[PDB]
């Protein structure tokens, strides 16, 4: 009665830290919020993280809950 | 699919219409939502129609 499965949705991180990206590029594909959008990063209705400006993507930790954020530095 | 589909016709003279779905028995009342009309470029009341 088993044997059913769903086709893989290829989630994960598409651009890693220190990598220059163009505006509108997708940085992370996620179901919930693994990472929270920081400066120059927007969160889509799908929780996808996209860059609102050209720069290098950076990871860090903020907030009382030690959550992980993604930001873009214009450099 | 017990919920069926309808058509909303703009009250204005233009024939532009929207489409949506609703449950007749639960809410048999008509729908008078105000929506944008591209032909006249104004927000007008759309009356539900067959």
């Amino acid at each position: 009665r088993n044997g059913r499965d769903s086709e893989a949705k290829r989630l994960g991180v598409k651009r890693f830290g220190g990598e220059s990206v163009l505006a509108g590029s997708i940085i992370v594909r996620q179901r919930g919020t693994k990472f929270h959008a920081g400066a120059n990063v927007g969160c889509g209705r799908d929780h996808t993280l996209f860059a609102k400006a050209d720069g290098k993507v950076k990871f860090e930790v903020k907030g009382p809950k030690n959550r992980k954020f993604i930001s873009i530095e214009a450099e | 699919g017990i919920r069926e589909k309808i058509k909303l016709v703009s009250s204005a003279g233009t024939g532009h219409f929207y489409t949506t779905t609703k449950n007749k028995r639960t809410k048999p009342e008509k729908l008078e939502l105000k929506k944008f009309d591209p032909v006249v470029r104004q927000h007008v009341i759309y009356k539900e129609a067959k």
Binding site: - | K5, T19, T20, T21
Partner: protein
């Protein structure tokens, strides 16, 4: 005898300046209430034929 062009293809692709072919997206015929307006808007404009299928297309209609 001269090659016979596939009539079905001739009604679905046109030659362009650089030898490419344009077509219409195959999702805007019926069952449109459930489709989002964004998806319908994107399918409206014509699209260029992909390279993978370009070889098949040119074979079907070698006269256009």
């Amino acid at each position: 005898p001269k090659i016979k062009t596939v009539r079905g293809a001739a009604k679905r692709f046109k030659k362009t300046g650089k030898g490419g072919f344009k077509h219409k997206h195959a999702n805007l015929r019926h069952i449109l209430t459930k489709k989002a307006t964004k998806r319908k808007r994107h399918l409206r404009p014509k699209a260029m034929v992909s390279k993978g299928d370009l070889g098949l297309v040119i074979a079907c209609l070698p006269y256009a």
